[PDB]
Amino acid sequence: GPSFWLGNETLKVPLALFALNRQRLCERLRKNPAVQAGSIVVLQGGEETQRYCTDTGVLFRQESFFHWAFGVTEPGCYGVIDVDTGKSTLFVPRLPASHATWMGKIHSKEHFKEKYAVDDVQYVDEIASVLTSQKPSVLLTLRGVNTDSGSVCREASFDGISKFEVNNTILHPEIVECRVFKTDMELEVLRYTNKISSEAHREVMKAVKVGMKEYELESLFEHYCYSRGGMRHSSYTCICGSGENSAVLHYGHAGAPNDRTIQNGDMCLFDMGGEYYCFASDITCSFPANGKFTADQKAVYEAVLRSSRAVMGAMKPGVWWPDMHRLADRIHLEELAHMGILSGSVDAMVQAHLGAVFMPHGLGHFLGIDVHDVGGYPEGVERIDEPGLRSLRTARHLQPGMVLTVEPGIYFIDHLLDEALADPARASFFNREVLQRFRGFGGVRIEEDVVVTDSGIELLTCVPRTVEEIEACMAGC
Amino acid sequence: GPSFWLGNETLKVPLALFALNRQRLCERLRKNPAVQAGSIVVLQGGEETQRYCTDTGVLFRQESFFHWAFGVTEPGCYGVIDVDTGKSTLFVPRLPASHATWMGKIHSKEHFKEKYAVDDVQYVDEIASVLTSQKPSVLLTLRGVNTDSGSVCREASFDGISKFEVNNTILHPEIVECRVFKTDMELEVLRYTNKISSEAHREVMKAVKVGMKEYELESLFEHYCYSRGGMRHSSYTCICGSGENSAVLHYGHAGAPNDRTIQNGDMCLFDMGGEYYCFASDITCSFPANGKFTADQKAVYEAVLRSSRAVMGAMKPGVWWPDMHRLADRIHLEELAHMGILSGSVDAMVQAHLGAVFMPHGLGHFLGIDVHDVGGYPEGVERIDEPGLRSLRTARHLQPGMVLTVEPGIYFIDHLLDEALADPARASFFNREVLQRFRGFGGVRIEEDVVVTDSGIELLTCVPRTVEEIEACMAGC
Numbered sequence: 001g002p003s004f005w006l007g008n009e010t011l012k013v014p015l016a017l018f019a020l021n022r023q024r025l026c027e028r029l030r031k032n033p034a035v036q037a038g039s040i041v042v043l044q045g046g047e048e049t050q051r052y053c054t055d056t057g058v059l060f061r062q063e064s065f066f067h068w069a070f071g072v073t074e075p076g077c078y079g080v081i082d083v084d085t086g087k088s089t090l091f092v093p094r095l096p097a098s099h100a101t102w103m104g105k106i107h108s109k110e111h112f113k114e115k116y117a118v119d120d121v122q123y124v125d126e127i128a129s130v131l132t133s134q135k136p137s138v139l140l141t142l143r144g145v146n147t148d149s150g151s152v153c154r155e156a157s158f159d160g161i162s163k164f165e166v167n168n169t170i171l172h173p174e175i176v177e178c179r180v181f182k183t184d185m186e187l188e189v190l191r192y193t194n195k196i197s198s199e200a201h202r203e204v205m206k207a208v209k210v211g212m213k214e215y216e217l218e219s220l221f222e223h224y225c226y227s228r229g230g231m232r233h234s235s236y237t238c239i240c241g242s243g244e245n246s247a248v249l250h251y252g253h254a255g256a257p258n259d260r261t262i263q264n265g266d267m268c269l270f271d272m273g274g275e276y277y278c279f280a281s282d283i284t285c286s287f288p289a290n291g292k293f294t295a296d297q298k299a300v301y302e303a304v305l306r307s308s309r310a311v312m313g314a315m316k317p318g319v320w321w322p323d324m325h326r327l328a329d330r331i332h333l334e335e336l337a338h339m340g341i342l343s344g345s346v347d348a349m350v351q352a353h354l355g356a357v358f359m360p361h362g363l364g365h366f367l368g369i370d371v372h373d374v375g376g377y378p379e380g381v382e383r384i385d386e387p388g389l390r391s392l393r394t395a396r397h398l399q400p401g402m403v404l405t406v407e408p409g410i411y412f413i414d415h416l417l418d419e420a421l422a423d424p425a426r427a428s429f430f431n432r433e434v435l436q437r438f439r440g441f442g443g444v445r446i447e448e449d450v451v452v453t454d455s456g457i458e459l460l461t462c463v464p465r466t467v468e469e470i471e472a473c474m475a476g477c
Numbered sequence: 478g479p480s481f482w483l484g485n486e487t488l489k490v491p492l493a494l495f496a497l498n499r500q501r502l503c504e505r506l507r508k509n510p511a512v513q514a515g516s517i518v519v520l521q522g523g524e525e526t527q528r529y530c531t532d533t534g535v536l537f538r539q540e541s542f543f544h545w546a547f548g549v550t551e552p553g554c555y556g557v558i559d560v561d562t563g564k565s566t567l568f569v570p571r572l573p574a575s576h577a578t579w580m581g582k583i584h585s586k587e588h589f590k591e592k593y594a595v596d597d598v599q600y601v602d603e604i605a606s607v608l609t610s611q612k613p614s615v616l617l618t619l620r621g622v623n624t625d626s627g628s629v630c631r632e633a634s635f636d637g638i639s640k641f642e643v644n645n646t647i648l649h650p651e652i653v654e655c656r657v658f659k660t661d662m663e664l665e666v667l668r669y670t671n672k673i674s675s676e677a678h679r680e681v682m683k684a685v686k687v688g689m690k691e692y693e694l695e696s697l698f699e700h701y702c703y704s705r706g707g708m709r710h711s712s713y714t715c716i717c718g719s720g721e722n723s724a725v726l727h728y729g730h731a732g733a734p735n736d737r738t739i740q741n742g743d744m745c746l747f748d749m750g751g752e753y754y755c756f757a758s759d760i761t762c763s764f765p766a767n768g769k770f771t772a773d774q775k776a777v778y779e780a781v782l783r784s785s786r787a788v789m790g791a792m793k794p795g796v797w798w799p800d801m802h803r804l805a806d807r808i809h810l811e812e813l814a815h816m817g818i819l820s821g822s823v824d825a826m827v828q829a830h831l832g833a834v835f836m837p838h839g840l841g842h843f844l845g846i847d848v849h850d851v852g853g854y855p856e857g858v859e860r861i862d863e864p865g866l867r868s869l870r871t872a873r874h875l876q877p878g879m880v881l882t883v884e885p886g887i888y889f890i891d892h893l894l895d896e897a898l899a900d901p902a903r904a905s906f907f908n909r910e911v912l913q914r915f916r917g918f919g920g921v922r923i924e925e926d927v928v929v930t931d932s933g934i935e936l937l938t939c940v941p942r943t944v945e946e947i948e949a950c951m952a953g954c
């Protein structure tokens with residue numbers, strides 16, 4: 001059948017991918033004992049937006065659940081799925097015949113039907129009529145709480161919906177759960193987003209020169225991803241932290257917009273990932289600006305390399321994700337002790353949650369259509385109220401088909417260091433004369449994207465990682 | 478004093494630019510007989526947003542009126558200006574000390590005071606208490622209708638505002654009028670945005686090759702603008718129309734995403750403009766994909782060049798903008814007749830509104846902090862209900878300090894030509910034996926940004942324009 005493509009060397013994504021998603025959603029819904037026969041899933045697509053009160057258009061990116069189900073790139077659509085039959089209907093805007101002037105061809109409904117391989121296409125203004133005709137028992141709409149933002153999903157509405165029975169509680173947990181497990185077709189797209197983003201990271205490492213602004217590398221990264229990968233969007237705002245900014249976890253946003261001059265001796269921590277057809281990638285590379293690790297930089301870096309590889313090697317079905325977080329903590333503490341920053345029993349350090357002083361964020365998260373993907377905390381899976389672990393975006397056990405980032409890091413963050421040094425249960429583990437050398441060091445994060453397999457993981461990311469590989473890459477070898 | 482700068486060769490913009498805007502707004506309001514003594518202007522800044530229900534952040538860009546008055550890059554602020562004294566107070570978010578875990582150093586109020594050169598800085602949650610202590614007579618808030626989008630400006634609101642007298646009618650027309658007339662400091666920024674965008678257009682003409690995707694040039698343009706000009710945003714989504722797509726006026730949006738392969742013999746129409754520190758640029762260059770104009774391409778192109786230069790030569794204070802639109806129409810019609818596409822009396826063609834068949838859009842618009850800048854249709858200025866002229870974004874008379882685009886074009890749009898050919902009042906002008914050669918030609922638009930001076934215009938844009946210049950640029954001169 002048909003495929004989404006941006007030509008050149010970009011990936012052809014079969015529209016069958018979305019058909020399979022629709023089938024899987026229906027299969028799950030049919031197993032749910034609360035679901036009535038004759039139910040119809042109703043999703044509302046994103047709409048075109050403008051900046052504030054202006055007419056300045058914002059580039060449209062589809063809403064993630066709607067994209068998962070339909071793969072539709074146009075704004076202003078709806079999509080419905082008969083649960084019992086699996087039959088899909090796309091609803092497209094009826095554009096005035098007088099509109100070929102400003103926006104482009106006025107495509108027929110037949111064009112959209114063949115483009116998206118759905119069962120039927122109707123106009124948005126006909127939705128109440130078309131639904132009334134099907135005599136559904138209930139409309140299943142999307143409403144629930146995203147566990148990363150705390151936002152409530154936008155439930156579909158249309159002129160005439162009040163005439164229907166509507167259930168807005170059943171669908172969200174089921175569609176979330178389907179999104180958690182990537183199909184083989186979805187994995188092909190994620191391999192591709194990781195391929196292009198990995199190439200772009202390598203180009204950035206080759207291009208970095210002392211004296212550049214951080215944003216020069218952001219620009220280069222996005223230019224590679226778009227011109228060579230067809231990635232018009234990134235998956236999140238690029239983090240190009242250099243020097244002390246590598247310790248700033250929330251960096252690159254408008255209040256800290258990648259505007260520091262990279263200096264000789266600085267570490268760089270670049271967390272960037274292109275998006276292709278609404279599928280994410282998320283990769284972080286850390287390396288010395290000047291292309292040569294100092295002894296202290298090599299020590300910190302190789303500690304995170306060790307925890308990265310230990311977590312990847314331990315991951316397999318049945319592994320509890322918080323145990324991976326604690327595994328990384330333990331390794332970091334051992335290496336920070338080997339380095340002389342810490343002294344004493346690593347067992348006692350773990351008991352005092354010292355790892356969270358150095359890695360306050362979660363070890364990694366699900367990834368898919370959203371970079372922080374849905375389904376980390378379904379009902380019955382509890383957040384753990386401890387330093388570090390409270391920041392984890394899932395406390396689930398791993399299963400085949402889950403896609404995770406693995407992103408341990410070690411940072412020297414003054415607020416956290418100083419808090420630990422004030423606490424008698426934690427202060428004694430520090431050698432202050434050694435820690436002093438590391439104030440302003442910045443931080444190192446190594447982030448890989450992986451898929452859980454039947455026996456372990458498959459790594460999607462392909463960037464230089466050892467000190468040797470990084471130095472050779474940056475030397476222009 | 479302090480300036481905004483992104484380093485390297487980027488423009489240093491003094492924060493005194495915004496202080497001057499605030500002073501101008503107060504001087505205007507002091508002269509307004511309806512403004513009460515002790516009035517305070519209250520503006521609310523833009524807030525940080527995420528994609529839909531996800532935690533994926535959208536890169537924050539300040540709201541335009543708020544930017545014009547304060548130049549503040551951070552989300553979540555408010556700003557007030559005492560009218561009688563001109564005293565400015567910025568209100569900033571209160572971040573808890575623990576956010577230093579994720580954000581590095583949390584900036585003090587003093588930091589923001591020095592950064593923005595305002596008189597005072599307070600936390601947002603203290604706004605009601607601070608205003609109460611000032612004992613203002615009335616708060617002047619922003620509400621009015623944007624004449625391009627039809628949207629209503631977001632009026633400031635905070636907890637406790639109901640305890641004050643609020644006027645939401647006076648401010649909008651006044652602050653809009655200040656924005657219409659650019660200061661010397663603003664013109665320096667618009668000259669810079671034109672310089673960078675001009676260079677980037679030149680790089681695109683040098684790089685275009687038959688066989689590329691349109692979006693490869695969008696990517697290159699945006700990369701030049703960000704890496705070399707510090708332009709993180711474009712002023713609007715890039716329009717990169719090749720071949721038939723050059724006749725689609727706002728091509729490049731999500732539904733038509735610059736995804737055509739450029740062919741030998743195609744015309745390209747590239748409408749792209751970087752934004753620096755929320756100041757716009759808007760430039761359109763038209764040129765043959767293969768670097769060599771055919772006779773037909775040269776004739777259409779030079780017709781638009783003729784109207785471009787006639788309008789620029791005619792613009793001066795006191796000129797009614799709709800007269801410039803009609804001037805361009807007349808020239809296009811003369812030239813289309815001189816190339817054999819039309820025959821008969823140009824006077825009769827103008828009476829028949831034939832110009833609007835070839836140029837269905839307005840001649841040009843105000844430009845400033847928004848690409849389609851505010852103030853085109855203040856109370857008393859009426860829209861003209863005629864083809865072409867109906868699309869004008871202003872019917873004002875020109876005055877010194879206004880900034881306008883001058884963007885005549887000629888396009889071969891099938892549904893417009895077909896309408897004309899089906900209308901006995903218009904059909905007779907066409908020579909179908911010559912017209913047939915231009916079906917699928919696309920279109921040409923030449924867009925310059927200019928400032929109205931005391932006696933004429935200043936051209937901001939600096940790209941090759943003659944056939945000879947364009948061929949030389951594409952040949953790498």
Ligand code: NA
Pocket residue numbers: 271272282283284447
């Ligand atoms: Na990341």
Ligand code: NA
Pocket residue numbers: 282405407447
């Ligand atoms: Na991540």
Ligand code: NA
Pocket residue numbers: 312313314315316455456457
């Ligand atoms: Na393993």
Ligand code: NA
Pocket residue numbers: 748749759760761924
């Ligand atoms: Na334009």
Ligand code: NA
Pocket residue numbers: 759842882884924
């Ligand atoms: Na324009």
